[PDB]
Amino acid sequence: ILSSIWTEGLLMCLIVSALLLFILIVALSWISNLDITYGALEKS
Amino acid sequence: FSHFLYYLVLIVVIVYGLYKLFTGHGSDINFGKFLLRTSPYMWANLGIALCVGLSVVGAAWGIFITGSSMIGAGVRAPRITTKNLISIIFCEVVAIYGLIIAIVFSSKLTVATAENMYSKSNLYTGYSLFWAGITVGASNLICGIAVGITGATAAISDAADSALFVKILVIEIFGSILGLLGLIVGLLMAGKASEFQ
Amino acid sequence: LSKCKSELIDAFGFLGGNAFMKDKKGKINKQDTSLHQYASLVDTEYEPFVMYIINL
Amino acid sequence: GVYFNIDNGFIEGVVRGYRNGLLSNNQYINLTQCDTLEDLKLQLSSTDYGNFLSSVSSESLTTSLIQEYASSKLYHEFNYIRDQSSGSTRKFMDYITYGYMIDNVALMITGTIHDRDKGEILQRCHPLGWFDTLPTLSVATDLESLYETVLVDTPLAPYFKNCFDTAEELDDMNIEIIRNKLYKAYLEDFYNFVTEEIPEPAKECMQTLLGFEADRRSINIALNSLQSSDIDPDLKSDLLPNIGKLYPLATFHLAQAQDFEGVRAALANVYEYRGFLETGNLEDHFYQLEMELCRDAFTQQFAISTVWAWMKSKEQEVRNITWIAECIAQNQRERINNYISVY
Amino acid sequence: LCPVYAPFFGAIGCASAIIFTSLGAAYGTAKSGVGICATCVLRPDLLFKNIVPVIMAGIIAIYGLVVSVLVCYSLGQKQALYTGFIQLGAGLSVGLSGLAAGFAIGIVGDAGVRGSSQQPRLFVGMILILIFAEVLGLYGLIVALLLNSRATQ
Amino acid sequence: ELCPVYAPFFGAIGCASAIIFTSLGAAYGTAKSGVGICATCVLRPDLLFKNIVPVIMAGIIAIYGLVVSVLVCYSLGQKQALYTGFIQLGAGLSVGLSGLAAGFAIGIVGDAGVRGSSQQPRLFVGMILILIFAEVLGLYGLIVALLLNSRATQDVV
Amino acid sequence: ELCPVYAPFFGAIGCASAIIFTSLGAAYGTAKSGVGICATCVLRPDLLFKNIVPVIMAGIIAIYGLVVSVLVCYSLGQKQALYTGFIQLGAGLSVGLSGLAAGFAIGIVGDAGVRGSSQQPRLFVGMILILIFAEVLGLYGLIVALLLNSRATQDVV
Amino acid sequence: LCPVYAPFFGAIGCASAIIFTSLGAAYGTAKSGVGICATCVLRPDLLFKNIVPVIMAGIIAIYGLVVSVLVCYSLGQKQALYTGFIQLGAGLSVGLSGLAAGFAIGIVGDAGVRGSSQQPRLFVGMILILIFAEVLGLYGLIVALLLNSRATQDVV
Amino acid sequence: TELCPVYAPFFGAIGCASAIIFTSLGAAYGTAKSGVGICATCVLRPDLLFKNIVPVIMAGIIAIYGLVVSVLVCYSLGQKQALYTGFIQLGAGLSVGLSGLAAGFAIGIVGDAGVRGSSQQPRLFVGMILILIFAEVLGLYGLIVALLLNSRATQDVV
Amino acid sequence: ELCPVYAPFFGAIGCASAIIFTSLGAAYGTAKSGVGICATCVLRPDLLFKNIVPVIMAGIIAIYGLVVSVLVCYSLGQKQALYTGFIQLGAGLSVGLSGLAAGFAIGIVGDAGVRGSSQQPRLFVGMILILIFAEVLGLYGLIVALLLNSRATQDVV
Amino acid sequence: ELCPVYAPFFGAIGCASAIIFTSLGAAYGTAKSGVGICATCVLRPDLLFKNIVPVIMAGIIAIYGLVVSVLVCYSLGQKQALYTGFIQLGAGLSVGLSGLAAGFAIGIVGDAGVRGSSQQPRLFVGMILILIFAEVLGLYGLIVALLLNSRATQDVVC
Amino acid sequence: ELCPVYAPFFGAIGCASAIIFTSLGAAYGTAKSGVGICATCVLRPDLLFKNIVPVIMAGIIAIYGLVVSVLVCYSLGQKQALYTGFIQLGAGLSVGLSGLAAGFAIGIVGDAGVRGSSQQPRLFVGMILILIFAEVLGLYGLIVALLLNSRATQDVVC
């Protein structure tokens, strides 16, 4: 057996849910860096 | 804060490895048994999905790099906005590379019998499809970004002078060698891999 | 001084007229704002009865 | 160059398109062959200036109206590029205009010492250096009542850190000191902004373009202090910026430079500014080196320093067109080819 | 052969197939809608022809919705790891592809609707660029709908 | 084995995250597009009651989270299957991390749109049209979570 | 097995979390919008007790966190079920990490609303209405956690 | 049921009750002290009137001290794991909420004493906002006291 | 044994180390940041030099608070000590250390801002001391918490 | 069991860490003070041997590590107790991470005092008086580790 | 058990570290002070072989690392005690991570000294004086590592 | 037990590291110095071949890595001792992470040296001497790894 706590199925759920959470953190850091061009909305 | 987590995970890995090694149980951190006992369908499906995902995140990357500068450079010189679309095309072909490799890989994806499930061949064709999906998706990612950069320079040098686009299309050709070489290597890696049996 | 200025304003201000009466009571000696400082010269506010504050 | 075109894709390609409208050497020779300001207008109409003097019609056309409208379309192109900017780019565009805000402050508070009218000392002000409380600098005379009333809400407020108001209100001698000191603190802050948040290809070629501004301002302060100034070097060293190529060894010798040779022997030890003070027009040497530093800032592609390198080159283009139109209107043609063209 | 943790991968694939696709579609709607709102304050008659990038970003989210619905009709308590990881792959494919295609449509769309107000010849240019970025979501949808057909065989 | 003891953990995380991340999305959509209302209704306050539509369409995302949180909460149990916990985790994330995206888009489009609608009054219809495409993202996440939650306890053992 | 020894850990950390993240969101909503009150009531000191609304609506979030941290606490106990601990952790997170978002959206709206409602008196009702839409997020987290905490000890063996 | 590693959670709950409330009180004292020492150079008469944000910061550390003493006098070697978990929760409840209360008191106190010298009427508004900022730590105190009242209630 | 394992003095040595480590970090910040203000406001006003050293004395008291608890945890370490003893010695060490660290941050920031502006207004000297007292009772509280944890380290241990 | 095989690991890490972090602190205290000296006496080089006091007081807190990393080194055996390794690790950290703080404080006070002592001649007494309080930090760490190391092999078995 | 199979790992990464972390501090002391020589001797090239003393004193600490790496290398064996591996790791870290500090100090002091010794020639004897204190920090680590390595295989058994 | 099956992993990554980090350092030393060569030989064309000595000096680092990696490669075996894998890992790190240091030093020295040597012709000898002091770090790493690799397979057994 691989382990009793860190079994064959838990340890490859925590790789899938680490890859997906990595893609999520990257995509949320893309959307967090999204700013509005305010000079093209004002009168000045 | 991310450097704090990078240091904390490193400290926890070192403390866990030295605790497991000092107490005479250091072979319990067993990466080979982890590779032997995880399902080959994880590696196969993960390789297929990351192939077609990372080809597209490089294709779409290059498309906005040489699209936004094409539209910016086309404001004064609008006679580039159709001729220079071959720079979109050269960074778009790296997605059809990953697509036609992902379908060829998914043809090797059948139901294996449970009595011969973690066999030599079934585990081989999980490893091969995993790394041959990685080496195609990452190569098409890097090729799409390189062709997008060398097309964004071409879209502005075209609007500068018309005779420069022919000279800087050659750099896009040498940049688009890379996705085709990844296309070759990912077919050679999963060339001897059989189906799941 | 602060207490003095207020008691006279309350008591006598009515004689000058209700229009004349404005509330901007208080005093800022720091240069953070230029409101809160009476003088008939400025349109911002006015003294409400003949009162000059003399600071030696 | 991998994360540039997210917010700066459209911005660069239009500025790169604005670069192609820079007049070449042949388009300057075709302007020096003109005989009339009307012929110069019609020669500029074939370039990317085309029909910018269309509402003039050959009668009220002077050599200052050309400098007005040719720079006005520069300013409107800068405003169009700034309106499409966001994030660090928009802040970089604001930091460019701060140096014009400083010049408009120092031009607005000299029009009140001389009691010149407020409506005519503001048409001489710079349009890019506009802040909303710029006409209200005509309310006080001393520095403290112009800071604490007007210049606190301005973005020029962190730059009043060393301007010591000794309750002498204002002559013409200390407004230049306040101007040089605001520009000193501004060059410090904008160099730290370029070093801090601007990415790496647009960092090294912008630190040089900004250290050149600091070196030129250091040489001009240390050389204009001979004729119309009698100041101590410990008070002169607060006017020289410390970001440039010239600071740690040569601005010390420019601080205690009591003579012209104290400047010349100080600038002989620096390698790229030696020979400027020997022969020729010094202002032409600085403008030529400015254009040679702006030329090789277009040669790096994915850089926001192309905006600085575009607007300084376009300002030099407006200066060259103004010099040519001044030559062909006053009928002096001995130095018509004194323009500066690296494009 | 069919463990107890096997519908984790299918449920998280059904999750990610709409999560990553809606993140990409939200970037493509927001960033290209900033360009619509910035463009149409000086030239407002281009408002309903500049609306194409947010429509294409919506088509991306429809492509992700299709895969999420078609994965959640094949989930069961006692499915194999084969079905679970093939639903995971069908989720990851359309997730990364819709995310990439939405980022590309967002970054191309605002630049396109800004160049279209200065030069009218750039409308066909931005449409022909955005069509290449649209079908990348189709390129992940193909792998997702092929891995769906191999779910229970 | 089919119904373990740690099985309500994923169900409780799915009940929590559906309201947590939609409250984050609705909070960004209210926040970013309410700064624009408070900035552009100091000059033209007559259109204060029509700029409120980004805030309302942001607050619909929190109701999308609330519905799925209630429907996951009334299917939790001590002896539920691990399948039920996995489906409730997926239905919580499918509403939460998609309504977070919808709320980001509503906040960005609303702040960019109520600032441009005071200079050009014809941009309001375009703002509403873009915000409908931004709100159907959270609606699609709601559809995915309802189709999961109908599948949650159907043929469980 | 069904009620293990580490079972009140999740309940105690949920009882902690429901006031920790709630007080953090309410502290952002108090500080960020108190900056605006202390900046605009220098010019307009007559509007102190009128612009105090976003600080009070930030405190109502902390009251929502307090009333769940005092209901999880009396449902705690040694040898309680692991299901009860998971439900209490979920009800802790649903109040805390959504009142965090509601406090962000109250603070960064209320500061701009206090900056704006000293210039335009008609913007104050719009400020209150946007703050109601920002405070109903924490109310939704309260509703999800109360409906969740009602099922913590309901027929649990 | 009452293991050996059980007072570890109680010791961490006794530490974290005073550690994070002292961090919050230290942020509040630092921000408010920078405010006072920059606003009382020109206005020294209202120096002792502006020390109220620093007092409101110190009451947060007193709140942490009380919970840490009450958790300290309930520790033991052979205590339950439930008691250790409740003491950890009661330490974190007062600590990470007094940290937030200290952040709010520091920001509000700095912004209020820098503007209360210009407007004298802003003092009764600053006190009113700091009351709402200090009740944020009083809530964590109440949660910590109600947890610690049940740390040894029905314990075997 | 079970109540007193072999790895039990690890937590005691970490609690003896951390109590002086983090208070030395806090006292070092309170000395350096508030000594910049002393060395900057003495080139024009050198007559107030022996009175502007209040924020470095009040910061060096934090290091003495760490030293006392480090000595008291050091004289309670044993090889066959309980695991409860090591746990609450770690607790005492963290209670002194991570609170004296915060007290040192507050003393450094407040003392820098106070000796920077006390050379301008002489009436701010009685104010910055009254703020530094509230900044130093933050470490005094951690001292009290660790002296109450250290009175229970070997009290009813088996 | 009381003296395991892995027991000299903590003693060797303590013997290394006693000198490693004091060398880092002494390096910082020497580096910033040397920049301050070399920038303050290009104009007044008469203060060269006068301003050497921060470099000396930063070099003393490395001798503080060199003492304890010899006294820990001469108590390292193959068959030593784990208690001895734990105390030697605590002593190495107690000197190291305290002399690192002392070196930070000496390095900041040193150049801040030698750049200002070229202007005011009687800031030198104040600089020494602050550097004594900055160097007793490393002295306190030395006292703590010398009291630990006198107990690492007192009543061990 | 007393001399396990993984025991030469710590000796090998102590032989490796004593040149890795030493040479990447010597490289900082060479580079950061060499950009101060090449920028100063464009006007004073007669001081070229006099300002190069920071580069020499940065090269000396790499020899300090080399000696300890050779002496740890020639005490490695297949069947050695784990105590010997721990001692050799401690000696390697004691040389490497303190010669890194000595190289940082030499690099920061040396370019500040050579840029200042051309304005004032009486600052060279001060640069040497500060640089000896900056360079003895690696000699202390060499003393600690040699006193460790003399204790490595003294009374080892099994 | 003493020559396990996973034992050539450490020798394989030691053979890899002596190319990876050494080519990374050599690439830094060629790139950053070639920037200075191409930036100063614009107006100084005759010094184009005197300035290659930083780039050649950085290429000798990659030759140092090449030699040690080939000499490790010709001692990898299937039935290899774990001691031998540990020694080859140490010898790979000792060349790689020291050649990276020497490459950093040559890359930072050499561009400043070719920028100052175009302005002062007597600075070339000083540049060459500082580059010798920078290359001797990678030479020290090669000396350590060649003395270390010679001890792999001396008294190995089983």
Q: What is the DSSP string of A1-44?
A: ---SSS-TTHHHHHHHHHHHHHHHHHHHHHHHT----GGGTS--
F39 neighbors G120 (Cβ within 8 angstroms): no
User: Phi/psi at D331 (nearest 5 deg)?
Assistant: 60, 25
Interface size D-E, in CB pairs within 8 Å, comes to 12
Q: How far apart are the first and last CA of chain L?
A: 9
Interface size J-K, in CB pairs within 8 Å, comes to 160
| Alpha helices (H) in chain I, listed in sequence order | 8-40, 54-74, 83-117, 125-149
Specify burial of residue D280 (Cβ count, 10 A radius: 0-12, 13-18, 19+).
exposed
The C-alpha of B59 sits at a distance from chain E's nearest C-alpha, in angstroms, of: 8
Query: Can you name the residues that pair with C31 across neighbouring β-strands?
Result: C33
F9 neighbors F88 (Cβ within 8 angstroms): no
Length of chain D: 343
Q: What angle do CA L9, L12, L16 make, to 5 degrees?
A: 135
Residue ranges of J 27-86 with Cβ closer than 8 A to chain K: 27-28, 30-35, 37-39, 41-43, 45, 48-49, 52, 55-56, 58-59, 62-63, 65-66, 69-70, 73-74, 76-78
Length of chain G: 157
Q: Which tokens sit at I80?
A: 């066959």
Sequence-separated (6 or more) residues with CB below 8 Å from residue B49: B102, B133, E88, E89, E90, E91, E92, E93, E96, E143
In a domain, B38, yes or no: yes
CB atoms within 10 A of CB H58: 22
Q: Is D235 on the interface with K (CB under 8 A)?
A: no
Q: Which tokens sit at B161?
A: 């002078």
Type of residue at L77: G
CB distance H132–G48 less than 8 Å?
Answer: no
Q: Which tokens sit at I11?
A: 């937590």
- Concatenate the DSSP letters of all residues of J143-154 into one string: HHHHHHHTTTTS
3-state secondary structure of B93: helix
Type of residue at E93: S
| CA dist., res. L22 & res. L26, Å (int) | 6
Specify burial of residue F123 (Cβ count, 10 A radius: 0-12, 13-18, 19+).
buried
| CA dist., res. E146 & res. B90, Å (int) | 26
User: Phi/psi at B192 (nearest 5 deg)?
Assistant: -95, -5
3-state secondary structure of H51: coil
Q: Which tokens sit at E87?
A: 């639903």
Closest CA to L151 of L88, L59, L102, L93: L88
I135 neighbors I60 (Cβ within 8 angstroms): no
Chains E and F touch (3+ CB pairs under 8 A): yes
For residue G131, what are the CA distances in angstroms to D295, F30, F100?
A: 53, 9, 19
Q: What angle do CA E103, B42, E145 make, to 5 degrees?
A: 55
Closest CA to G54 of G122, G118, G108, G119: G108
| CA dist., res. B165 & res. B159, Å (int) | 9
3-state secondary structure of F2: coil
User: Phi/psi at D278 (nearest 5 deg)?
Assistant: -95, -60
Residues of A in contact with F104 (CB under 8 A): 31, 34
For I101, half-sphere exposure in the C-beta direction (CA atoms, 13 angstrom radius) is 19
User: Phi/psi at C33 (nearest 5 deg)?
Assistant: -165, 165
Residues of D in contact with C29 (CB under 8 A): none
> DSSP strand E in chain E: where?
none
- Selected residue of H39, H52, H72, H81 to mutate for chain I interface (largest I Cβ count, 10 A): H72
> Which residue is associated with the tokens 């860096």?
A33
| CA dist., res. H140 & res. H102, Å (int) | 12
For D282, half-sphere exposure in the C-beta direction (CA atoms, 13 angstrom radius) is 14
- With the CA atoms of J59, J65, J69 and J70 taken in that order, what torsion angle do they form, in degrees rounded to the nearest 10? 50
Query: Method of determination?
Result: cryo-EM
Sequence-separated (6 or more) residues with CB below 8 Å from residue F108: A34, A36, E30, E31, E33, E34, F32
- Concatenate the DSSP letters of all residues of chain L into one string: --S-SSTHHHHHHHHHHHHHHHHHHHHHHHHHHHHHHHHHTTT-GGGTTTTTHHHHHHHHHHHHHHHHHHHHHTT--TT--HHHHHHHHHHHHHHHHHHHHHHHHHHHHHHHHHHHHTT-TTHHHHHHHHHHHHHHHHHHHHHHHHHHHTTTTSS---
Q: What angle do CA I3, J90, J145 make, to 5 degrees?
A: 125
Q: What angle do CA D89, D90, D94 make, to 5 degrees?
A: 115
Q: Which tokens sit at D44?
A: 């500029």
- The secondary structure of residue B38, as a DSSP letter, is S
Residues of F in contact with G81 (CB under 8 A): 78
> Which residue is associated with the tokens 């688009």?
B176
L61 neighbors L131 (Cβ within 8 angstroms): no
3-state secondary structure of H38: helix
CB distance K62–L105 less than 8 Å?
Answer: no
Sequence-separated (6 or more) residues with CB below 8 Å from residue C21: C13, C14, C48
The continuous run of DSSP H or E covering D315 comes out as helix D305-327
Q: Which tokens sit at F73?
A: 């909460």
| Alpha helices (H) in chain F, listed in sequence order | 7-40, 53-73, 82-114, 123-152
Closest CA to B44 of B112, B138, B128, B141: B128
K105 neighbors K139 (Cβ within 8 angstroms): no
Domain hosting B18: range is 5-190
Query: Can you name the residues that pair with C33 across neighbouring β-strands?
Result: C31
Chains L and C touch (3+ CB pairs under 8 A): no
Closest CA to F76 of G82, B41, D110: G82
Residues of J in contact with B18 (CB under 8 A): 9
For D246, half-sphere exposure in the C-beta direction (CA atoms, 13 angstrom radius) is 29
For residue B102, what are the CA distances in angstroms to B88, F10, L31?
A: 22, 32, 38
| CA dist., res. D132 & res. D148, Å (int) | 16
**What region does L153 belong to: left with phi over 0, alpha with psi -120 to 50, or beta?**
left
For residue E153, what are the CA distances in angstroms to B193, E8, E76, E81, E83?
A: 21, 20, 15, 13, 9
E38 neighbors D84 (Cβ within 8 angstroms): yes
Sequence-separated (6 or more) residues with CB below 8 Å from residue B116: B122, B197
Count helices and strands (H / E) in chain F: 4, 0
- The secondary structure of residue D251, as a DSSP letter, is I
Sequence-separated (6 or more) residues with CB below 8 Å from residue D76: none
Sequence-separated (6 or more) residues with CB below 8 Å from residue I33: I108, I109, I111, I112, J108
Searching chain B, which residue's CA lies closest to the CA of residue K9?
A: B21
Give the chains touching C; criterion: ≥3 Cβ pairs < 8 Å. D, G, H
For residue B130, what are the CA distances in angstroms to B43, E91, E150?
A: 5, 17, 18
Q: Which tokens sit at J96?
A: 């190291």
CB atoms within 10 A of CB A35: 16
Q: Which tokens sit at L21?
A: 């980090």
Sequence-separated (6 or more) residues with CB below 8 Å from residue K55: K29, K30, K33, K34, K37, K110, L129, L130, L133
Q: What angle do CA F115, F116, F118 make, to 5 degrees?
A: 80
> Which residue is associated with the tokens 């020390």?
H51
Searching chain B, which residue's CA lies closest to the CA of residue J9?
A: B22
| CA dist., res. H2 & res. I2, Å (int) | 13
Closest CA to G120 of G55, G31, G44, G45: G44
Residue extents of the structural domains in chain L: 1-157
| Alpha helices (H) in J82-151, listed in sequence order | 82-114, 124-149
PDB resolution in Å: 8.7
Searching chain D, which residue's CA lies closest to the CA of residue A40?
A: D83
| CA dist., res. I136 & res. I142, Å (int) | 10
Type of residue at D342: V
Closest CA to I66 of J26, J94, J64: J94
Interface size B-K, in CB pairs within 8 Å, comes to 4
Type of residue at E119: Q
Sequence-separated (6 or more) residues with CB below 8 Å from residue C42: none
Chains A and I touch (3+ CB pairs under 8 A): no
**Crossing angle (nearest 10°) for helices G53-72 and G82-116:** 170
| Alpha helices (H) in B23-119, listed in sequence order | 31-37, 40-73, 86-106
CB atoms within 10 A of CB I113: 24
For residue J57, what are the CA distances in angstroms to E48, J98, J128, K135?
A: 74, 14, 9, 15
3-state secondary structure of D102: helix
